[PDB]
């Protein structure tokens, strides 16, 4: 069983590039970290920052998050991200993207010890 860490890790860390710097990074990245195995996953977002960067978030903003749980905090400074989105011609197993690079706060639910993000709950 992945943890809930290791499990925001895999779906929303991208540390190794600074940007998508084409329309296909959803495509490759959505497949790469297996989020395209059983189903097409429809939503994600990528965080292109330092894991500490993103980490040290749960000691920021405090913010409710949008399900009215309160270990919700928002990054005090914008942060590059990637959208990624199944287009209308995605169908399992063939999943489309589309790829939407931006800079955006971050919304992380924290959880554990030590508190930590494992939850993605929307960019601002
Ligand atoms: C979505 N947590
Ligand atoms: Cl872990
Ligand atoms: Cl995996
Ligand atoms: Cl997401």
Redesign the pocket.
Known sequence: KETAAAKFERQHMDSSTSAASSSNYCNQMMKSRNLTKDRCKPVNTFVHESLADVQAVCSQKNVACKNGQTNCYQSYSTMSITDCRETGSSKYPNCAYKTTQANKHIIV?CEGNPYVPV???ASV
Do not use: Y
């Open positions: 639910a939850h993605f709950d």
